[PDB]
Amino acid sequence: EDRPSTPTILGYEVMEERAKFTVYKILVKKTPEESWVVFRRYTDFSRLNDKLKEMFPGFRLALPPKRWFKDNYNADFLEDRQLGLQAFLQNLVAHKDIANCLAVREFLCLDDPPGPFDSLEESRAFCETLEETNYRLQKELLEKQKEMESLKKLLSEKQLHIDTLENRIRTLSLE
Amino acid sequence: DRPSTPTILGYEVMEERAKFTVYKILVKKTPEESWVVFRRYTDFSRLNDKLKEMFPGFRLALPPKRWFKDNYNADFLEDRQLGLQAFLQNLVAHKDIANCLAVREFLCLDDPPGPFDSLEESRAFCETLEETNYRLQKELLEKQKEMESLKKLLSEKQLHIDTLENRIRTLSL
Structure with missing residues (x-):
């Protein structure tokens, strides 16, 4: 020790x-x-x-x-x-x-x-065998596809929220 | 035929x-x-x-x-x-x-x-596991690139969103 x-x-x-x-x-x-x-x-x-x-x-x-x-x-x-x-x-x-x-x-x-x-x-018993690496890789690519899809959805929604905020700001900009 | x-x-x-x-x-x-x-x-x-x-x-x-x-x-x-x-x-x-x-x-x-x-x-025609994994990692890299770019845009949009909402809070009073 x-x-x-x-x-x-x-x-x-x-x-x-x-x-x-x-x-x-x-x-x-x-x-x-x-x-x-x-x-x-x-x-x-x-x-x-x-x-x-x-x-x-x-x-x-x-x-x-x-x-x-x-x-x-x-x-x-x-x-x-x-x-x-x-x-x-x-x-x-x-x-x-x-x-x-x-x-x-x-x-x-x-x-x-x-x-x-x-x-x-x-x-x-320590390093990854080819199959395990291949598996791991397929997991990563799939997960990335779903996730990136989710990100794109959030992008659309957040930009439309921006349009809403901008117009209400115009509305209380005049009054 | x-x-x-x-x-x-x-x-x-x-x-x-x-x-x-x-x-x-x-x-x-x-x-x-x-x-x-x-x-x-x-x-x-x-x-x-x-x-x-x-x-x-x-x-x-x-x-x-x-x-x-x-x-x-x-x-x-x-x-x-x-x-x-x-x-x-x-x-x-x-x-x-x-x-x-x-x-x-x-x-x-x-x-x-x-x-x-x-x-x-x-x-000659087939991809062997080494080649398959190689390609898969290449793809994974490119995707990580794409997602880098997207998270960048989401960050920009969210920063703007907080800016506008603070302006609405200030113009509320």
Whole structure:
């Protein structure tokens, strides 16, 4: 029960759902005895961070630039990305309140850490499988369609109210 | 005459470490020269979106999309194949739906794969889950743009509304 040392990113390797993904190997050390490795995608970092912006607005963390879906297999960058993520982890456990944070603990498996020979199992049980992502996406697009429709309705009604207000203002403008 | 009723031959469970169901569709033109097209539930749905796009007037059936419950079941698969079969009957039975760009690009009327080309044509026409998700996120972005613009206008209108109502309050006395 104290300061977690800066989790180390060893490197990354490209793995598969037979969609090719880049995954990062993060070694995290509890005590000089207990230590383990977790696999995280850039995306998992992004999600954790979004939850962090949500939970602690007061302190906000940097992350290297998103791919923007257009993929780069490239000099620097990927190295630069890893440096950035490493910085992210350092600052993330350096902040007294965001470190013992729950989502973070879930992220680094501080509570129920994976064993030496597992890491993959843990992996697959943390990141979103393609179907789940697809589902999530369809939810988001639909919800946006209904909501945006509701917004348009409110727009019409509020503008007509503006016409009413304007004319009554003319009426008590003369009298 | 012109290509009649594509009947679906069957299905096979495929993978890229996410499991596909693909449907083997038999497509004929004249008494001879028969060929095969490979399509998944995804593409059928896409085509259906295109028809609901250009031609609102008639809407076509498709078996229930199912998510979490087991994607591969006796009844579920059977109905899927049956319904899709129906979709096809309707798809070629109608005038202009037999000849339309998306429809011919779909059923490979012009350059149909006869030989092993079929497996090839698969990977060439269809959106795989990566591609599907990619596109879906692109769309989601654009929508968030549109809603950014709308919330901006609603904010303007509401600001004006409070301005007018305060003026009415001041001109009340």
